[PDB]
Amino acid sequence: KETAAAKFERQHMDSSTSAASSSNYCNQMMKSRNLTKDRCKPVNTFVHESLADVQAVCSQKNVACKNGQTNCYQSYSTMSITDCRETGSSKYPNCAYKTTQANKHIIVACEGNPYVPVHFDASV
Ligand SMILES: [Cl-]
Ligand SMILES: [Cl-]
Ligand SMILES: [Cl-]
Numbered sequence: 265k266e267t268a269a270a271k272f273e274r275q276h277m278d279s280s281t282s283a284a285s286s287s288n289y290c291n292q293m294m295k296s297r298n299l300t301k302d303r304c305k306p307v308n309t310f311v312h313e314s315l316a317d318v319q320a321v322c323s324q325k326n327v328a329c330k331n332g333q334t335n336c337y338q339s340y341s342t343m344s345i346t347d348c349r350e351t352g353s354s355k356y357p358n359c360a361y362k363t364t365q366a367n368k369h370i371i372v373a374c375e376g377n378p379y380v381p382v383h384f385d386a387s388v
């Protein structure tokens with residue numbers, strides 16, 4: 265039901281903050297974005313740039329996706345991101361995440377018309 269583009273936005277965009285606040289940032293965002301609803305999503309990255317800047321990566325450097333697809337694009341500059349990863353002691357429904365703030369290039373897979381990000385492949 266949710267489109268691939270809308271799901272990308274819900275799971276990865278956080279333009280309201282320039283960077284991960286506290287160490288509690290991942291526990292509040294994984295929950296508020298309904299990512300701990302049926303289970304604990306194990307890993308997830310949030311991008312703290314405007315939607316328009318993330319969408320423009322689809323016109324940047326074309327690289328291979330980890331899965332071998334060729335519709336991946338690496339951003340030219342680094343972006344503010346937050347990595348959210350379940351801790352060894354996380355157990356649904358008590359999901360617990362480690363927040364790691366970093367500044368790096370993002371690699372996204374793009375598709376459709378308009379050609380927008382539909383999958384977060386990795387950061388470098
Ligand atoms: Cl959409
Ligand atoms: Cl939702
Ligand atoms: Cl991710």
Ligand SMILES: [Cl-]
Pocket residue numbers: 275382383384385
């Ligand atoms: Cl994804």
Ligand SMILES: [Cs+]
Pocket residue numbers: 341342343344
């Ligand atoms: Cs930037």
